Amino acid sequence: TTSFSIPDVGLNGIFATQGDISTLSGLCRIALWYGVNATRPEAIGVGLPGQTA
Amino acid sequence: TLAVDEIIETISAITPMAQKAKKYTPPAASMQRSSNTIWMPVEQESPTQEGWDLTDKATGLLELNVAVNMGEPDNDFFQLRADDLRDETAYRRRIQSAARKLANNVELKVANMAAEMGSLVITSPDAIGTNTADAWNFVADAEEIMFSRELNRDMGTSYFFNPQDYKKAGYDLTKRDIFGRIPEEAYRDGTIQRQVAGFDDVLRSPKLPVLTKSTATGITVSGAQSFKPVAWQLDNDGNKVNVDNRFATVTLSATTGMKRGDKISFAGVKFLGQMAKNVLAQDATFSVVRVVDGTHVEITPKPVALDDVSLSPEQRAYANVNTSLADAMAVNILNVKDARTNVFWADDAIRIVSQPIPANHELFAGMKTTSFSIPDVGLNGIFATQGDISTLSGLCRIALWYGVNATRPEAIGVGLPGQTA
Amino acid sequence: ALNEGQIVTLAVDEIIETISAITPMAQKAKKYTPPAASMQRSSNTIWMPVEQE
Amino acid sequence: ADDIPSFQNPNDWVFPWLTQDTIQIAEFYEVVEKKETAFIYQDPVTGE
Amino acid sequence: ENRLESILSRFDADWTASDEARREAKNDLFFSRVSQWDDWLSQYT
């Protein structure tokens, strides 16, 4: 494994590789672990235009 | 009982053909995309006319090409176990045996390709010890056919005997009742000479294949066929796809008993002088490369005819046979008995395309890959090891990627002695 | 003419960019990073206090 | 000053700490070695 | 081709190259300066 940086957003992931000798192949995996949590739903809002019956 | 790590050495081989053949390593990045095949042009031949008023008779241009590609890797996958003490001492020697085996396999492929794609065939009606200087005559026939065909021999020429016929040649040399320098060398050692009848290197190769007899009989060309030199052709989508110059598919009456490597010759066609286009007295000989379908075969020297009228002049510039196929001519078979072959060639007719196996990349992390030099021959493969998830074990893989290509089948030859019966 | 020579096919490595995206929402959201191996796949929840009324 | 900058935050969320700062920016120094023109004047006093 | 792209490519290379050494050093600084008990999964259970 090694670290993997993501553009734009300031997140860091993991970059892992593995080699298989039998088939002479390689697996590569990029994993990113995060959670988007809204701690104040009363502060988050939504605007809906054109709500006609 | 006491095992004693005192190796009883038992085998010792040699790879003359493989260490002699030229080696080519094209750029891997381009060869990945080009489907592991590349194209190489062929020396140009010019048509010629004589006269004063040559209006509307201006020829075009035409340059032919050959395609060289690669096969599949030759591995030595094996499993290594610690906690054995018999896989501790055996592994160190298993690596070396693997290297020798891979070199031997490369040489075997080279010899087989040369023997089954050598267009020029020199057949003899009896064994080599039948007459005096008969081995010299056998080598000189090959030299004479190369000279008459006027094939490029700047790089060199080489003749490979099998042990049987090499010993017969040495016996012929020693029986002379005269001892100068050549008979004394053929007495003290088995060597005939390092150069015989004009060849620049006359060796003996123990792994020369045996060309089994052909049970093909009563075969005739089915319908007139004209083969035209070409450098590409249109595919179904309108694209231009290159054409390999070293093959021609003929339609016979019945291709029963033929196989890859059969030496044949049609009745009536004769070799030309290539450059001068003068008709030789020899029968043009071809080699069966593939038995496709049941009434078609694929012979390696494309029989461009000199008297063909459907050939545009720049195509007729490449003629190497005096007459085309005449829809009933008998196709005689030249290998009528089982005989281990003697193989001659020009040194620039066989190449060994090689590629790498990039197992040192970041992708193949966890398996340790180093280079691995195959001895004798000039080739490099990979040596990769990786352990198991548990149980204190491992795996080893010695891999080598190459492909043996015969770019000049008309310059590769075959010698078949004792072709009676 | 009829220069019936040898035909190849070219591939140039001047790529043609076609996608161009922006992430204002994720740039505006505040990124928090627990240290090293702070929380595992099993327990990754966190309880934070709410300002007292 | 209206556009608050952001960069890879080099610190980690220390749970027992009430407040951590959130403004980040980067200073990127790079060095270029090149052959540039130099003038050999003659000193009005002495030397060059 | 973008100047920012080249700068950030170099920075990402260096940042991902010096990762584990930086995190070990940060751990050592925290251990030596704030607390020797970084047991944060527990300490709350």
CA dist., res. B170 & res. B183, Å (int): 8
Could A2 and E8 be called an inter-chain contact, meaning their C-beta atoms sit closer than 8 Å? no
For E41, nearest residue in chain D (alpha carbons)? D15
Contact: D12, E34; criterion CB under 8 Å: no
Residue D8: which of E7, E15, E30 has the nearest Cβ? E15
Where do the H-state alpha helices sit in E1-45?
Answer: 3-17, 19-33
Enter the tokens of residue B27.
Answer: 């750029």
* Alpha-carbon gap, residue B194 to A53, rounded angstroms: 104
Q: Which residues of A touch C31 (CB under 8 A)?
A: 9-11
Give the distance from residue D9's alpha carbon to the nearest chain C alpha carbon, in angstroms: 8
Whether B319 contacts B305, CB under 8 Å: yes
How far is it, in rounded angstroms, from Cα B68 to Cα B56?
38
Number of inter-chain CB pairs under 8 A, A vs D: 6
Q: C46 touching A, CB under 8 A?
A: no
Integer CA distances (angstroms), B102 to B7, B9, B89, B384, B414, in order: 21, 18, 21, 15, 25
| Contact present, B128 and B419 (Cβ < 8 Å) | no
CA atoms within 13 A on the CB side of D27: 0
The CA distance from B248 to B230, in Å, is 12
- Chain D touched by E31 (CB under 8 Å): no
Q: Is the Cβ–Cβ distance between B162 and B421 less than 8 Å? A: no
Q: What would the two tokens of residue A52 be?
A: 């006609």
**8-state DSSP, B280:** P
Length of chain E: 45
Residue type, B209: P
Flag whether residue A10 sits within 8 Å of chain E, measured between CB atoms: no
Cβ atoms < 10 Å from Cβ of A43? 7
The packing angle between helices E3-17 and E19-33, to 10°, is 60
> What letter would DSSP give residue B104?
H
Instruction: Please measure the distance between the N-terminal and C-terminal CA atoms of chain E and give it in whole angstroms.
Output: 51
How far CA B118 is from CA of B252, B261, B394, B415, E36, in Å, comes to 21, 8, 44, 9, 80
Q: Are B70 and B355 in contact (CB under 8 A)?
A: yes
Which residue in the block uniquely carries the two structure tokens 């009430």? D18
Give C25: exposed, middle or buried? Use CB within 10 Å, 0-12, 13-18, 19+: exposed
**Residue whose structure tokens are 């249109």:** B234
SS3 A11: coil
Are E and B close enough to touch, i.e. 3+ CB pairs under 8 angstroms?
no
Closest CA to B266 of B236, B221, B228: B221
CB pairs under 8 A between B and C: 32
Are the beta carbons of B231 and B39 closer than 8 angstroms? no
Distance CA B15, CA B103 (A): 7
Residues in C lying within 8 Å of D, measured between beta carbons: 27, 30-36, 46
How many Å apart are CA B79 and CA B91, to the nearest integer?
Answer: 9
Cα gap B319→B48, rounded to integer Å:
13
3-state secondary structure of B242: strand
What is the residue type of B282? Answer: Q
B37 touches chain C (CB under 8 A): no
Q: Is C27 helix (H, G, I), strand (E, B) or coil?
A: helix
User: In whole angstroms, what is the distance from residue B9 CA to residue B100 CA?
Assistant: 13
- Sheet of B22-24, strands arranged across: B22-24, B350-354, B402-406
**CA geometry: angle at C42 spanning C39 and C45, to 5°?**
55
Q: List the strands of the sheet with A2-5, edge to edge.
A: A2-5, A12-20, A25-31
State the best of E41, E42, E43, E44 to mutate against chain C, taking most chain C CBs within 10 Å.
E41
Q: Which domain holds residue B302?
A: 211-339+408-416
State the resolution, in angstroms: 3.1
| CATH code for the domain of B222 | 2.40.30.240
Rg, C-alpha atoms of chain C? 28
Q: C35 contacts in E (CB within 8 Å)?
A: 26-27, 30, 38, 40
Q: Determine the distance in angstroms separating the CA of B147 from the nearest CA of chain A, rounded to an integer.
A: 48
The Cα–Cα gap between B25 and B352 comes to: 8
> What's the CA gap between B237 and D4, in Å, rounded?
58
Task: State which amino acid sits at residue A41.
Answer: P
Whether D28 and E11 lie within 8 Å, measured CB to CB: yes
Method of structure determination:
cryo-EM
Rounded CA separation B255/B268 (Å): 20
The angle formed by the CA atoms of residues B408, B250 and B303, to the nearest 5 degrees, is 45
Task: For residues B329 and B223, give the distance between their C-alpha atoms in angstroms, rounded to a whole number.
Answer: 10
The phi and psi torsions of B328 (rounded to 5 degrees) equal -145, 5
Query: Within an 8 Å CB–CB cutoff, is residue B91 touching chain C?
Result: no
Residue B313 phi/psi, 5° resolution? -55, -40
